[PDB]
Design an enzyme around this catalytic site. Structure first.
Site, PDB file in Angstrom:
ATOM      1  CG  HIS A  88      -1.789  -1.261   1.168  1.00  0.00           C
ATOM      2  ND1 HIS A  88      -3.001  -1.348   0.508  1.00  0.00           N
ATOM      3  CD2 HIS A  88      -1.569  -2.461   1.701  1.00  0.00           C
ATOM      4  CE1 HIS A  88      -3.516  -2.550   0.695  1.00  0.00           C
ATOM      5  NE2 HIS A  88      -2.664  -3.261   1.391  1.00  0.00           N
ATOM      6  CG  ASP A 145      -2.968  -3.602   5.002  1.00  0.00           C
ATOM      7  OD1 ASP A 145      -1.819  -3.056   5.045  1.00  0.00           O
ATOM      8  OD2 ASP A 145      -4.071  -3.029   4.684  1.00  0.00           O
ATOM      9  CD  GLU A 146      -6.987  -4.908   2.171  1.00  0.00           C
ATOM     10  OE1 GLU A 146      -7.109  -3.642   2.194  1.00  0.00           O
ATOM     11  OE2 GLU A 146      -7.934  -5.709   1.892  1.00  0.00           O
ATOM     12  CG  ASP A 175      -3.535  -9.379   5.799  1.00  0.00           C
ATOM     13  OD1 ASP A 175      -2.375  -9.199   6.294  1.00  0.00           O
ATOM     14  OD2 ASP A 175      -4.186  -8.531   5.209  1.00  0.00           O
ATOM     15  CD1 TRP A 199      -6.829  -6.785   8.618  1.00  0.00           C
ATOM     16  CD2 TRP A 199      -8.644  -6.744   7.318  1.00  0.00           C
ATOM     17  NE1 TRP A 199      -6.455  -7.211   7.381  1.00  0.00           N
ATOM     18  CE2 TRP A 199      -7.545  -7.212   6.570  1.00  0.00           C
ATOM     19  CE3 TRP A 199      -9.906  -6.682   6.723  1.00  0.00           C
ATOM     20  CZ2 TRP A 199      -7.665  -7.613   5.251  1.00  0.00           C
ATOM     21  CZ3 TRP A 199     -10.024  -7.114   5.417  1.00  0.00           C
ATOM     22  CH2 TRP A 199      -8.922  -7.566   4.697  1.00  0.00           C
TER      23      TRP A 199
END
Ligand SMILES: [Zn+2]
Length: 456
Positions: A88, A145-146, A175, A199
């Site tokens: 991100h 994260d993702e 994750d 989350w």
């Protein structure tokens, strides 16, 4: 089970408040029982040196950031920085400057963990933030994260840098590790390095969450956090308040925490996520003012341990809405930070539903088709019933745009307002206007050609 730490996410990837308005927000956050905030500066921080160039043009000054954190501190609000350390990172890697640093040269999302010049940029980024945040919190969130070893050795690396240099505890998104063998976790002494934040923004988590996910994690780490949503997880193009949705997430989270509290050295708290875009490149979702109702009701709901007509009612008098009313239905005369913007954007929601219902009825469907529009060939009589409705809705949407621009301009920077209008308001004015032009032209025709007439 009541989480002792209740943290409000502030996502600044977009619609980032002007700096004098954080006090208001923060005081509201105290008034609903938040213990702290999670600040994801993204591109809005006063970055310096090599990072100066990847700063938003409307980026916050040093004097602003110092005042924000002071104000947080004085209001007895904990501050946890969120700094993305693997992915991100579009905001950083998307120019020429760090092109070389990307995992995949086409994707500005991830940085190559195995390229140490890149890992070096990341650690500077952390330090540049912690410079300001060091004196002000016990926690830092590093994202993630993702092959899983390169990841974990990246985390390890980052963790220790923070832990060692600033003496804080590292939180990351879950994750990245929910899958991994308990073995690998131990190999990297993760029980001593990181606090996984799990989350889930779904309404029924019981439906989405694997079973003994909690049993999995308690067998790996002593500390665990949880993460709900108050905004930025209905739809990417969600621009209005849908409390019913987030509320299901919060009820569904209570049950989960009341089962998971006990298997951890400590379930540290819950982070109320508030995404402003689904990602750097995505559109703006719900503005913070729009999320205040959601956020108000969901904080009280986690501190009261359930939702009931009691919760509903404290909620309203905190928003100073007009008595009666339902937090899940319409609200009128509320007075909270951004309440004008809420009011106006909620009207937008309503007007737009009317307009879509009108564009779906028999009149527009049957007689303002594409052939009508392109071959000016339809029934004047049907125009006489449409053109008036098009003109009203068009003029109302013009006034809504004005009002929202004014409201939003006291709290937000132009780009953000321009983006909102460009996305959620203007296409409709334009579309009403183009229909109003052709329906007016047809209304003015009195003589039509016999069939068949060429079409393509
Ligand atoms: Zn790589």
């Amino acid at each position: 089970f009541i989480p002792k730490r209740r943290i409000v996410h502030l996502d600044l990837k977009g619609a980032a408040p002007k700096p004098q308005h954080f006090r208001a927000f923060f005081e509201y956050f105290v008034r609903i029982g938040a213990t702290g905030i999670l600040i994801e500066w993204e591109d809005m921080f006063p970055y310096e040196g090599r990072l100066s160039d990847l700063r938003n043009g409307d980026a916050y000054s040093a004097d602003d950031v110092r005042m924000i954190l002071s104000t947080a501190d004085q209001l007895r609000l904990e501050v946890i920085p969120l700094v993305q350390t693997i992915g991100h990172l579009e905001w950083l890697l998307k120019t020429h400057k760090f092109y070389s640093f990307r995992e995949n040269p086409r994707n500005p999302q991830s940085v190559c963990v195995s390229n140490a010049e890149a890992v070096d940029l990341v650690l500077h980024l952390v330090d540049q933030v912690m410079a300001f945040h060091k004196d002000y919190g016990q926690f830092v969130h590093i994202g993630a994260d993702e092959r899983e070893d390169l990841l974990l050795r990246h985390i390890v690396n980052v963790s220790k840098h923070v832990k060692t240099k600033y003496g804080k505890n590292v939180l990351m998104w879950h994750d990245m590790i929910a899958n991994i063998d308990a073995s690998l976790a131990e190999k990297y002494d993760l029980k001593n390095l990181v606090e996984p934040v799990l989350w889930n923004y779904a309404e029924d988590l019981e439906a989405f969450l694997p079973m003994g996910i909690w049993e999995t994690f308690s067998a790996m780490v002593p500390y665990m956090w949880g993460s709900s949503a108050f905004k930025g997880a209905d739809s990417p193009t969600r621009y209005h308040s849908n409390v019913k949705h987030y509320l299901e997430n919060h009820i569904s989270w209570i049950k989960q925490m009341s089962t998971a509290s006990e298997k951890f050295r400590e379930f540290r708290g819950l982070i109320f996520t508030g995404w402003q875009r689904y990602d750097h490149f995505a559109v703006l979702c719900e503005f913070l003012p729009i999320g205040i109702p959601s956020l108000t009701v969901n904080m009280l709901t986690i501190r009261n341990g359930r939702f009931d007509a009691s919760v509903n009612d404290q909620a309203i008098s905190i928003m100073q809405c007009v008595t009666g009313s339902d937090v899940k239905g319409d609200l009128y005369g509320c007075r909270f930070p951004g309440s004008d913007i809420y009011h106006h954007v909620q009207l937008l929601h309503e007007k737009k539903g009317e307009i879509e219902k009108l564009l779906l009825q028999q009149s527009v469907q049957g007689w303002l088709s594409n052939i009508a529009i392109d071959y000016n060939m339809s029934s004047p009589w049907y125009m006489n019933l449409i053109v008036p409705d098009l003109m009203t809705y068009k003029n109302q949407m013009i006034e809504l745009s004005l009002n929202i621009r004014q409201a939003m301009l006291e709290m937000f920077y132009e780009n953000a307002v321009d983006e909102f209008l460009f996305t959620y308001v203007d296409p409709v004015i334009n579309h009403l206007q183009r229909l109003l032009d052709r329906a007016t032209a047809i209304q003015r025709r009195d003589e039509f050609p016999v069939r068949p007439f060429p079409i393509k």
